[PDB]
Every structure is written in structure tokens, then in C-alpha cells.
Design an enzyme around this catalytic site. Structure first.
Site, PDB file in Angstrom:
ATOM      1  N   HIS A 105       0.793  -1.228   0.000  1.00  0.00           N
ATOM      2  CA  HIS A 105       0.000   0.000   0.000  1.00  0.00           C
ATOM      3  C   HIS A 105       0.826   1.279   0.000  1.00  0.00           C
ATOM      4  CE1 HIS A 105      -0.131  -2.069   3.915  1.00  0.00           C
ATOM      5  NE2 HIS A 105       0.052  -0.904   4.500  1.00  0.00           N
ATOM      6  N   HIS A 118       6.372   6.820   5.540  1.00  0.00           N
ATOM      7  CA  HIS A 118       5.879   6.340   4.267  1.00  0.00           C
ATOM      8  C   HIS A 118       5.176   7.492   3.554  1.00  0.00           C
ATOM      9  CE1 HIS A 118       2.405   5.950   6.985  1.00  0.00           C
ATOM     10  NE2 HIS A 118       1.757   6.375   5.915  1.00  0.00           N
ATOM     11  N   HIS A 137       2.056   8.895   0.442  1.00  0.00           N
ATOM     12  CA  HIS A 137       0.864   8.722  -0.364  1.00  0.00           C
ATOM     13  C   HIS A 137       1.033   9.644  -1.549  1.00  0.00           C
ATOM     14  CE1 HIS A 137      -1.137   6.731   3.058  1.00  0.00           C
ATOM     15  NE2 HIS A 137      -0.406   7.577   3.759  1.00  0.00           N
ATOM     16  N   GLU A 167      -3.481  13.169   1.300  1.00  0.00           N
ATOM     17  CA  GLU A 167      -4.633  12.694   2.063  1.00  0.00           C
ATOM     18  C   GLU A 167      -5.322  13.867   2.729  1.00  0.00           C
ATOM     19  OE1 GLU A 167      -3.261   9.159   4.362  1.00  0.00           O
ATOM     20  OE2 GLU A 167      -4.232   8.145   2.707  1.00  0.00           O
ATOM     21  N   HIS A 175       4.154  10.771   5.759  1.00  0.00           N
ATOM     22  CA  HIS A 175       3.754  10.485   7.132  1.00  0.00           C
ATOM     23  C   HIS A 175       4.899   9.901   7.931  1.00  0.00           C
ATOM     24  CE1 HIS A 175      -0.710  10.197   5.807  1.00  0.00           C
ATOM     25  NE2 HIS A 175      -0.305  11.438   5.980  1.00  0.00           N
ATOM     26  N   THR A 203      -4.937   6.261   8.574  1.00  0.00           N
ATOM     27  CA  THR A 203      -5.640   6.449   7.307  1.00  0.00           C
ATOM     28  C   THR A 203      -5.705   5.186   6.468  1.00  0.00           C
ATOM     29  OG1 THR A 203      -3.792   7.171   5.980  1.00  0.00           O
ATOM     30  CG2 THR A 203      -4.986   8.881   7.242  1.00  0.00           C
TER      31      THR A 203
HETATM   32  O1  LIG Z   1       1.609   2.697   7.394  1.00  0.00           O
HETATM   33  C1  LIG Z   1       0.979   1.555   7.950  1.00  0.00           C
HETATM   34  C2  LIG Z   1       1.459   0.237   7.370  1.00  0.00           C
HETATM   35  O2  LIG Z   1       2.809  -0.037   7.717  1.00  0.00           O
HETATM   36  C3  LIG Z   1       2.931  -1.313   8.307  1.00  0.00           C
HETATM   37  C4  LIG Z   1       4.246  -1.941   7.847  1.00  0.00           C
HETATM   38  O3  LIG Z   1       4.284  -2.107   6.445  1.00  0.00           O
HETATM   39  O4  LIG Z   1       2.847  -1.234   9.716  1.00  0.00           O
HETATM   40  C5  LIG Z   1       3.792  -0.393  10.381  1.00  0.00           C
HETATM   41  O5  LIG Z   1       3.171   0.762  10.911  1.00  0.00           O
HETATM   42  C6  LIG Z   1       2.089   0.505  11.796  1.00  0.00           C
HETATM   43  C7  LIG Z   1       1.505   1.815  12.331  1.00  0.00           C
HETATM   44  O6  LIG Z   1       0.790   2.507  11.331  1.00  0.00           O
HETATM   45  C8  LIG Z   1       2.551  -0.346  12.971  1.00  0.00           C
HETATM   46  O7  LIG Z   1       1.391  -0.748  13.680  1.00  0.00           O
HETATM   47  C9  LIG Z   1       3.360  -1.552  12.529  1.00  0.00           C
HETATM   48  O8  LIG Z   1       3.975  -2.156  13.642  1.00  0.00           O
HETATM   49  C10 LIG Z   1       4.440  -1.129  11.553  1.00  0.00           C
HETATM   50  O9  LIG Z   1       5.161  -2.264  11.114  1.00  0.00           O
HETATM   51  C11 LIG Z   1       1.676  -2.059   7.848  1.00  0.00           C
HETATM   52  O10 LIG Z   1       1.297  -3.156   8.650  1.00  0.00           O
HETATM   53  C12 LIG Z   1       0.648  -0.946   7.907  1.00  0.00           C
HETATM   54  O11 LIG Z   1      -0.539  -1.208   7.177  1.00  0.00           O
HETATM   55 ZN   LIG Z   2       0.009   7.406   5.761  1.00  0.00          ZN
END
Ligand SMILES: OC[C@H]1O[C@@](CO)(O[C@H]2O[C@H](CO)[C@@H](O)[C@H](O)[C@H]2O)[C@@H](O)[C@@H]1O
Ligand SMILES: [Zn+2]
Length: 257
Positions: A61, A91, A93, A103, A116, A195
């Protein structure tokens, strides 16, 4: 599973995650005229000097840079926050074209992309526990517009070819996220959510007013990633943004007059 397309995108998410229709969902439109300056807000403290980046990954994503969050190294404090929040990952968007991708919006303006930086509250011990709390996470949101290249982004851009598809990752050590920050830390803040599914209502949002500029070539490289894993192909990773959600009973506060 969930995605951004017609049959699995944002308008479908509520079926598996009913909180999608909740009282503090993100993102939102920031109405600059309605947001009120709050003189009691404190300057944001962004202390990233000892950040330790670990990996870069395509999670299907977005792409994401991860950090060691086992000690107070890279932390966010002050502003609207009580306590200390550790950086775990950042990360982005972005859009298929420069006129969409963000967003949050500002007076309905969409930026080309949005960064973010996700932090969690040390009083809850780990991020999994933090996502279950209304003040568990703080996300620093930064808008991207297209113009001059952002030098601090280039190290990221140059390895995206190595993580084209979902599941791929690479070593990404010694990355300094200070190079992604604009000059001003003027911000808007409001209580909201993740989000992306599970859309947990655990985030204090801090959205910086000043965008960073990135070049056409830099964002072009974002747009070559894939949502799909190798062999499932293919869903180009573009327009991975949730639209603005209803503000409901919330106030957006500004740190600046
Ligand atoms: O951005 C969210 C997305 O990132 C992942 C890792 O690919 O999760 C990370 O971020 C989360 C918080 O938003 C944490 O809960 C998690 O520990 C961390 O690895 C995906 O799981 C998530 O959809
Ligand atoms: Zn985000």
C-alpha cells in the site's frame, strides 16, 4: 484484501473496519479560516539526530522506511503532545498526476503527495499497544509539491527499483529523516485515526503548513512501484490516498498566527 481500487478501495473499508465511519477519522480537509490559533500550543520538538533507520519495504500500500524504536533515539515531543513519541517508520501517499496524491487537503487543495512520519507514545511500551489508545500515536504529516528536487529524498528514490512489488525489502541504514523536513514547523493539529486499515482512532495529527518540493523525476519514480506482489501482476502503485473524511465534532488548531 483492501486496497485503493474500485472494488476494494476506501468506500469499501467500512465493511471489515466499521470504525471507518467513526467520530475521529482521518484524513480531513483543513479549512484554514476556521482553524483557530491556539497560543497555548507549544513548539514542536522534532529530535531526529540519533535516528537509526533499518529497512525500506514495499508493503503493498506504500513504501516505508523503518527505524529502531527500542530506545528514545528519534523522538517527537511538545506541540499538542504530552510525553514522548518514538519514530517507527515513514511512508508516502501520492497520485497518478501532480494534482492529487495527498490525504489531508488545505482549503480543498490536494498536493502531489504526503509524507507520514509515524511515532508511538512510550507510555504504552510498544506500537501494538499504542494503536489501542486514543493518544497512542502521533503522525507528522508533510505535504509534497512538485518543483525543485529534495536532496534528502534522493537516497530513497534511488533504491525504489529494488522494491518494486509487495513484499520486497532492502537494507536502508544511515538514512537521516531530518533531510525531509521543511524550514518551518508551523502546524495544524487535530485528533484522528490511521488512514489505512485498521483505521484505529489512536492518532494525534500534526500537519505542517509548509510543503517540501520534490522534483518531477523523484515523484515519477514513486509511480513505478506496484501494489501487487511479483507474479500477481499488476496494479501500479498510484493514488494510494484516502480522501478527506467528515470532521464531525472536532476542532483543528493552528500553532501560528
Ligand atoms: O503505514 C501503515 C502500514 O505499515 C505497516 C508496515 O508495512 O505497519 C507499520 O506501521 C504501523 C503503524 O501505522 C505499525 O502498527 C506496525 O507495527 C508497523 O510495522 C503495515 O502493517 C501498515 O498497514
Ligand atoms: Zn500514511
Amino acid at each position: 484484501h483492501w486496497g485503493y481500487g474500485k472494488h476494494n478501495g476506501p468506500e469499501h473499508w467500512h465493511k471489515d473496519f466499521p470504525i471507518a465511519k467513526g467520530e475521529r477519522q482521518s484524513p480531513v480537509d483543513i479549512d484554514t479560516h476556521t482553524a483557530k490559533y491556539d497560543p497555548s500550543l507549544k513548539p514542536l520538538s522534532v529530535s531526529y539526530d540519533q535516528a537509526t533507520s533499518l529497512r525500506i519495504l514495499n508493503n503493498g500500500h506504500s513504501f516505508q522506511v523503518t527505524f529502531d524504536d527500542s530506545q528514545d533515539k528519534a523522538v517527537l515531543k511538545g506541540g499538542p503532545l504530552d510525553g514522548t513519541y518514538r519514530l517507527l517508520q515513514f511512508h508516502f501517499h501520492w497520485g497518478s498526476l501532480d494534482g492529487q496524491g495527498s490525504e489531508h487537503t488545505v482549503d480543498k487543495k490536494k498536493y502531489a503527495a504526503e509524507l507520514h512520519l509515524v511515532h508511538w507514545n512510550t507510555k504504552y511500551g510498544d506500537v501494538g499497544k499504542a494503536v489501542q489508545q486514543p493518544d497512542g500515536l502521533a503522525v507528522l504529516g508533510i505535504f509534497l509539491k512538485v518543483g525543485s528536487a529534495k536532496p534528502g529524498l534522493q537516497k530513497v528514490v534511488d533504491v525504489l527499483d529494488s522494491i518494486k512489488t509487495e513484499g520486497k525489502s532492502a537494507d536502508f541504514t544511515n538514512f537521516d529523516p531530518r533531510g525531509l523536513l521543511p524550514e518551518s514547523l508551523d502546524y495544524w493539529t487535530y485528533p484522528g485515526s490511521l488512514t489505512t486499515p485498521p483505521l484505529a482512532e489512536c492518532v494525534t495529527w500534526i500537519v505542517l503548513k509548509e510543503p517540501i518540493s520534490v522534483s518531477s523525476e523523484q515523484v515519477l519514480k514513486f509511480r513505478k512501484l506496484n501494489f501487487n506482489g511479483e507474479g500477481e501482476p499488476e496494479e501500479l502503485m498510484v493514488d494510494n490516498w484516502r480522501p478527506a473524511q467528515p470532521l464531525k465534532n472536532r476542532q483543528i488548531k493552528a500553532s501560528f498566527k
